[model samples]
Target: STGSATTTPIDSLDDAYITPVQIGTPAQTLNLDFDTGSSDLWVFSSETTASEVDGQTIYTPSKSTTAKLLSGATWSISYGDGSSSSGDVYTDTVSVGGLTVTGQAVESAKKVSSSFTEDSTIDGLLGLAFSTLNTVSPTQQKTFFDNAKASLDSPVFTADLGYHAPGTYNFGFIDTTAYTGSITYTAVSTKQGFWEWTSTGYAVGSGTFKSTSIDGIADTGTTLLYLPATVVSAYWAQVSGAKSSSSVGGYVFPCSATLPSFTFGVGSARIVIPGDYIDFGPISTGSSSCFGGIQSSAGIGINIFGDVALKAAFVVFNGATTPTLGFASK
Candidate 1:
């Protein structure tokens, strides 16, 4: 079967694209971030501490007849930004788009870090990465995609993230009509439980392109496009008035800057990131200071093609043998 869901980007903040999902027997709908960086389907629920609950809608498993406890099973995870959540597990039906998975493991939060509680928008995360990264203990759980893969017409998914606009996440099939040009395919290394691949080369602005290979991962959960410090510094150098501000945080620039395009190679093709999209938005409330969307990758010596980079192209995340990434211009 094929399924597709509309992804809505939050007002003014393109940090994450959220899609509504139905969980439990009777169906309790909640907005969730379809994350490709991690493997855990966690949610803000009645189990979370009262003080920790922000404006997010909570899920009540006890009210769902299909909810079944995993009996002492619990899970905890830390994000790249240090955000974390820990919760108990429940097996319940989960519906995504028009597709449904029986006995989907839903992690109900009992504890959440300040990072999670501060973000009042999304209630949970729908992990698209391999289930090997799942955090459930006593028995690791399967992801919605993994559980539904067997019934799918094809094991694949697509991400079409847009700027200040709505996009989509399609499951079970790839819609060729959604993209332009031919989809250039690249092999993925699933060893680290990420859609990791090596970049062919990168060019900043209109300068000469270099012939260096940088290993990176494609992550939809992350907002910024993180690269090596050396590469990051190179790109920032081209942005006039751009400065690294420890006080305001990240690489800050003027709001009126037109910016320069950043291009990175995948196989024989290079995907160009429009300069205007590099403006991450105002760094502070009621201030003109803006943050650069492309930042350092936390000194991990690796890079990440976050939403900022991914949205510039159409992506096909294939889960079959020799998992691969297919990119096309939108």
Candidate 2:
């Protein structure tokens, strides 16, 4: 079987893309971020503290006849940004697009950090990353993709992210019409539970392509592309009036600066990120200085090929025994 879901950005900055999901027997629908960077199908629900619940939708497991409690099971997850959420676990029928999983682990958030509470657009997260990163104690549960993989026509899912438009996340099959040219496949190091891979090299705009391997994860949850300090500083150097400021948060440049495109190699294929996408947005409301979409991953611990890079191409996250990542121009 196969499935497809449309994901749309919540804001002009493309901060995050959200997809609707149906959980429980009564099918409570909620908008969730399909995050490939982590492994946990958690959601805001009736179990969550009333004060923590913003204007977002919440799932009521008790309202669903098919919901079953995963007794003694609990989960907690923390992100690189230090934000976190934790709660009890329940097994319920879950649906994504046209696909269904009989007993999907639906983590009900009991407590959430301030960052999650402030974000009123997204109600929860549907993790697409490997199940090894699952946070459930005593009995870690499988991700929605892992649970549905056995019934899928093929053990694969693809992400076609967009800039100012809506994109798609296709499961079980790759949509040939979604991309151009042949896809370049790369080996994924699933050891750390991330869709991690190493890029061949990079180039600043039309400059020479440096032959330096850079390791990073294809994280759809992240908002920016983070690279080594050298690579990040090099890109900013080319932009006039660009400065790295702690107060402004990372690198920011004049909104009128003539930006340059960024290119990264996947094997022999080079995917170019349009400069317009690099101008993330103004650092503040009505501010002339705009934040750079590409920043140094120095303190971040790991480089990330976030939405800034994924938006430039069609990406495939193969869940086979020997997992691999595929990239194609779109």
Candidate 3:
């Protein structure tokens, strides 16, 4: 399901969960978080008995003409972020874009944790990060990629996240039109499940910050871009009147004006984080306020550039013939 208008791969693994065959199709599209740490595509089912989860959107199989249940099989998943869910297995003919993949395996949850049950928008998560950690057995597992790779015109898949929408995740052939031409790639290190890279440096408001070298991992499963404390403070300082607030913990400023844009360079590729991301919602931090997008995760030992930054660009993880990563644009 990964390809562009001219070149498309019938099947190719992007990272973990199989990439859906098409981008804009309306057939049972579950907007799930793509994580590398886990290899299960678990969605909240309308059949699920309501519980205590937050912001969860349950998938209603009865609403789909092509859905079928995978009787006798049970599924459960837990994330590093403390979110978990359990459900039954199901199969259906899932259509993405113009392509249709029959017998697609999906997990229909009967019970979900509070973190997921509470979310009204996040129905489920798509684990496209890698297959090594897949909870499903190889004999029983079927990913979106496994079904589409052979049909794709080439052995590749690309993803693009919409700007205005936080969860607008798209997959198909790599669309180069939205990009500046040519892709910048890096080698994948197997030590961590994440795609690792060394940041050349950072910039804010057109001025360069030469103090530190940021080494981090790109994780689609995570929701925010975690940076060092000093780096976060330095970048926030560029915004006029930006101050440390005790309500959230990091830095906060009035959202009335547009803040300066910040960029992180991965080798030669420069990724820009827009102002809206800087104004992310607040969270409790022991009597202090913090910027939503940029926060202090120094002790966590990893600076993760999660899906929020990735969805902004068309990304490809080339693991077919060799271990490498590449990027295009939306």
Candidate 4:
């Protein structure tokens, strides 16, 4: 869904928090993360400082004529990558795609980092991946889906990652044309935001990784599919003269040959990663080698099935009705 553009409005403010709504009336907009690995929605506000706000979009309530702020509740959040932010809680009327939703909760940060401050285009992120990893909660922090359940066109929300292009992410009502049939849904475990599962094995071209199966989570919040060292080395071995390049931080092989197609099974579901995505962008090394999407994240406990893999299909995140996750096609 790269280059696909949809506009939502900054409705009202609950203190420093900004709420999002569709561009039209009567529609509610959920605050979401533009994340590739984890899918969820959240917002930031005035209580957060400039330091904690790096690499994020911030909304100023004062700038919006229709904004309002709540008085008592406060919130804080920390990411696995060591990034964190805190702010007071407030409700605001916001707009997205011309739809309006009232009393949306927002976080105000008093401290945000310079990296976040640099981006003026983004106000806050709208995550639509799978887990609740990027939220401000020890137990019950609100997610965009959690709040939008009452207002969305349907009870279901589908993500169109491949809508615009390779790196684009899109959200809205599920388009039924994207699936072969009813999608297979995976129940969410009680482990909070991490969607952990046991992989039956991997299918690389016609070859499969069955010797040592991979057990990990599928995350949309991350940008790359982190594989174990054993799996990574085995797959790279198949590519003639493939080696890790320090500049790209992973293995690179000559792009001239048609790379192998990779498919991983989750229960009965078989997810595929197109070969073209593996060779995206410019190669770090001088050789004809192109970067392979698969990288080594040996120590990292979680394995993220980032946007690169997601752009090829339609994903349904059913957090409101039940703890079920669904996947289809776009």
Candidate 5:
């Protein structure tokens, strides 16, 4: 049994990573967004649409009493430029940082997208991949770490992610002082339920390491660090005013240039990424052109790594049954 959750970074370009759940029966905390690249825990609720809510935070479930109502299910999801959301389903008694589970399932939202109603920093999305990407239907639920990974203690979950600070999300052991060396592992591919894997190559600052293999997906709900356009044009050909812009739509550069540091490879352990986390800022509000947290997945046919490569390592997600994906350095 284990559980711990913190995950803050909701702005200053750390885009999203909230946490703080607890839904139903006398609970109802909200905050969510623990997404390990989709499954479907969803929320935002009181049945949504008060003109699609705005200041966020909902989840009323009729003031819980242990919610319940999975009759006929229903759900949705989408993105890749069509942004979406949908809803219906409930089971309740969730909880996170202190790990409780009972029933779980949750879902709720009733449609959203105005970019999630102007992102008030997430009030939904707990997923964690696998559960076969769950989008409930006539019957698909599970995730809440696959129903608490069978009384955990070691079905595993981790993911430290920090840079704009605050991060955690552990469940079922493996803290060991948050990482420093010796973790690596790999083999993941849950048949596309994501957390997929394959790295073995990359380097840009101290140059030369491209052993090539790359296939990807470790998306903590994505936020940059895509790859292959020959490794993002070999890391923007070592800066000096990068470009590849279609009018600031990809790559960009020169918000004072001088950036590099992105290593990679997981099998023999590498994980570097710290040229101010690829300097992904400035391409707008007072822009001097900066957008590039390591972009170009050619049109995103795979390769993601996201949260700019999971804020430089400490993931784990080893849910056994052959799953694996460790990586350390933190």
Candidate 6:
């Protein structure tokens, strides 16, 4: 029995796909961004100062008899984008879709960055990366999947993210009906606590695939794809009115500019990101400027297969020995 449970990911602000999560007894449900890039399940909680938090649901651990403090333990995390959150620790029952785990580590936030404070829809972040990345101190904690996997029929999970439409995140099971075509598998290295893998090559639109290899991670939490600088510049070269803006920090194109599809390779498997997905919508509504969703990965030292890229394929983050990433067309 590949014990199965799947939850729908709600499209939010063209940046992330959030899923509903339940923590503690009596099940306090909150919408959370399921992030594969980081490993701290931090949430806006009662511990947060009133002045620091606004328009976000706060988790009340004391309200649940089942909640237990992981005394002396605390967690602090900072994302690559400068988004940060810090908090106390609690052990509570956590559920996602039909999958539930007892005594899961829950990070209750005391502080958050301005970016996090303004994003009202996000109640927390559900970290889906390796447990080794968990940030709790005094005693490190295991993620919900880590606690639940030993008993799971198979150590695996699949993410089916849609563009604006709701998609499902499957736990402990793979639905044969979720995608079409063969699921191509690729090797993954978790040395960096990420689903890092190598792509054989890539091509722009219908052009022939170049032999240049790229190493990157499949990060569901990231909003845009990050490629090499030269590669990014090359993509912009194809668009007539695209230019790099010092103010924008990335190349922006005229709102009416058309784009070519971007193709990436995984061993022998090929995934193509549609033209419209590259436009990344307008820079500002009712304006004539837009930024390309694919940016340079120079800062992170890793190219990222972000939401813009992952949504283009059905992704399987296999956690078994030598964890491999499986890709298939929708």
Candidate 1 residue lDDT tens string, 188-250:
999899999888889998988887988889999989899888888999998788898989768
Best by the TM-score measure: 2
Worst 10 residues of 6 by lDDT: 1-10
What TM-score does model 2 achieve against the real structure?
0.99
Per-residue lDDT over 1-330 for candidate 6, one digit per residue giving the tens place of the 0 to 100 score: 233333344443358877888888899988889889988888899989788788888899999889999999999999989889998999998888768888999999999999988878889999989989999997888877778787777788888888767788888877789888889999999999999998888888778888788999999999899999888887888889898887888888888888999999978888988988777777777878988888888777889999888988899988897799999988
TM-score of predicted structure 4 = 0.72
Winning candidate number (lDDT): 2
Query: How do the residues 1-330 of candidate 4 rate in per-residue lDDT, one tens digit apiece?
Result: 111223222211101112233311232343434543443334544445645555454456675545555555555555555555456654565444333445555555665444446544345554433445544443333544545556666555555554223222223465566566567676655364555555657777678546445656555545456778777777677777778888776888877766666676655677777666555434743557767777777656666565555555566656555545676644
Error at 221, model 1, angstroms: 0.4
- Give the TM-scores of the predictions, in the order they appear: 0.97, 0.99, 0.74, 0.72, 0.36, 0.96
Clashes of each: 0, 0, 53, 82, 0, 0
Model 3 per-residue lDDT tens digits across residues 47-72: 67765545455567777666777767
Q: Who is ahead in lDDT, 2 or 5?
A: 2
- lDDT (CA) for every model shown? 0.90, 0.94, 0.59, 0.53, 0.86, 0.85
Count of backbone collisions in candidate 6? 0
Pitting candidate 1 against candidate 2, the one with the higher TM-score is 2
TM accuracy, model 5:
0.36
Sequence-dependent TM-score of model 3: 0.74
Give Cα distance to truth, residue 328, candidate 6, Å.
0.7
Candidate 2 RMSD computed on C-alpha atoms after optimal superposition onto the true structure: 0.7
When 2 and 3 are scored with lDDT, the better candidate is 2
lDDT of 6 at 138: 74
Q: Candidate 2: where is the Cα deviation over 4 Å?
A: none
